[PDB]
Design a binder for this molecule. Sequence first.
Ligand SMILES: Nc1ncnc2c1ncn2[C@@H]1O[C@H](COP(=O)(O)OP(=O)(O)O)[C@@H](O)[C@H]1O
Ligand SMILES: Nc1ncnc2c1ncn2[C@@H]1O[C@H](COP(=O)(O)OP(=O)(O)O)[C@@H](O)[C@H]1O
Ligand SMILES: [Mg+2]
Ligand SMILES: [Mg+2]
Lengths: 283, 283
Amino acid sequence: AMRQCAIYGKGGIGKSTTTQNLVAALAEMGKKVMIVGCDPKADSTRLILHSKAQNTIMEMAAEAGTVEDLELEDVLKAGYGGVKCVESGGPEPGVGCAGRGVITAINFLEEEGAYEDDLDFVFYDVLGDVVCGGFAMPIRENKAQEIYIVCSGEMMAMYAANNISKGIVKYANSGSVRLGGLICNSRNTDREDELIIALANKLGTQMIHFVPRDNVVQRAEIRRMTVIEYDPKAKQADEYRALARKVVDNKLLVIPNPITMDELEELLMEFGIMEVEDESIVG
Amino acid sequence: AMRQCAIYGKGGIGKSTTTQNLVAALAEMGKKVMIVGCDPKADSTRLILHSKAQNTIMEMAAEAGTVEDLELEDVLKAGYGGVKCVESGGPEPGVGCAGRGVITAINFLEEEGAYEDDLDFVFYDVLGDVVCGGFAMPIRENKAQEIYIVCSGEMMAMYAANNISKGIVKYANSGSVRLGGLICNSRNTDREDELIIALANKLGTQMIHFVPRDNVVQRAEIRRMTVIEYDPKAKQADEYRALARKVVDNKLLVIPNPITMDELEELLMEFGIMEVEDESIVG
Ligand SMILES: Nc1ncnc2c1ncn2[C@@H]1O[C@H](COP(=O)(O)OP(=O)(O)O)[C@@H](O)[C@H]1O
Ligand SMILES: Nc1ncnc2c1ncn2[C@@H]1O[C@H](COP(=O)(O)OP(=O)(O)O)[C@@H](O)[C@H]1O
Ligand SMILES: [Mg+2]
Ligand SMILES: [Mg+2]
């Protein structure tokens, strides 16, 4: 058995930091994991590979001739803890469809035997600002059974969580794609944990973890590492281990109940997210 | 003559707040303006209309039968300062292409005579996390000659600015689409103004204005108003008037020079954006 998981969320919310650190914690436990980058930014594997980024399937297929000229052992690279890494890539801005590379990448990995019996987890790191084309494919074509949405007390982050949830509902007649949880990636905003717990309850899921805002992330990433590798004794390393334990143990996988913009606005007004005038901890 | 402008930028960066306040300032001067919402969130006109939002062309076409059953006087509503407002809308998450509504909306407005001789400005408020489908259309089909990109010292915001700039370059053989400027929507981060000035210089443009982070925006928006209407004597009202004056007077419209991710990373490292540990003004 393997668990196919996808990390969705708006741009800049912390999908790649969260996914690579969660996966580093799973590898540290002895789990075998593959990360599939499904974001055109294509830096979803750099902290596992100690790299600038990784050459994408779209880029390499173009150099080799066709995608059928590529070998698995060429798009798939191992880094920290033997975690296997691949990047979809996508077309340059203003050309075709930004998500087209995800379709090509996932089909290539399936055909070429990437999904080896002894993988415990696969994580897709997926752009979530639009739910269409290749970005919808993991949900529409039943590739990721467990969706975890990284969000914050930001209206845009919660709107994106609600939109991804609407996509999961749309495809619930087919396949087994479910919402597994919200991950609150802290803005250092007051009552933000309570806000995302409230949003998770309205959607019918849970807040699986509150990830603190910790500068050790910046210090680790300047050195192209996860916090797990950079400073395994950091408080933030234990935060990612807590997230990893709760993902491993999670059994709540639901068809979510998307909410209205009225409900989103009421949540923000309720937890005083818009009336606050400073961070919880200053500094 | 009329100036067709588009406001691009990543999700949550401040496109709709900035556009509606800039446009309110233009109306306050005596300019005739239309806002065209090109973001599926479809709340790009609510502060002009004193409204929850506005019913979208996609929604109304479906109720009327075809888009040819709609009349202009039905998708186009006037609010503060006689500013005319329309929302494209888009398909629900997981259905078709998130940008399809923008194509339908702009073609409808052109056919039905929305672009009246005495308009001074049109502003398209465009989702910028992906540069494809309807979101690329204002650039690909030469609808918005002046692109202004709202950004911040956030890597994701600067990456999005660079991607939009790559889209403008791609279509420079045709039409007259140009980069007009960066608008820095402040995160209250130290040396952020210097960072976006540096990015603008690398791209060959300018930072047309630094918009401060001011809670008066939240107080105005809870009352469904621009700061211009809510408190015309606010410091932030004068900030939007300054932006509006510089847009009116702007003559620098360039084919930008997109930069490498190495250059983006070097900018952030140079201005100490990643090593900072608190906001410029605490509180
Ligand atoms: N918990 C955190 N603490 C500190 N910085 C964080 C945290 N999570 C993410 N970041 C930073 O936020 C930025 C965006 O995160 P990233 O994972 O790249 O977002 P996404 O992949 O969703 O676009 C990066 O600079 C990253 O280091
Ligand atoms: N300069 C600012 N000062 C304070 N709050 C701001 C400012 N600019 C934007 N905001 C707030 O940030 C949020 C996102 O802005 P918005 O314009 O809706 O983003 P976008 O349209 O790019 O998704 C809103 O709550 C808005 O009030
Ligand atoms: Mg990422
Ligand atoms: Mg908006």
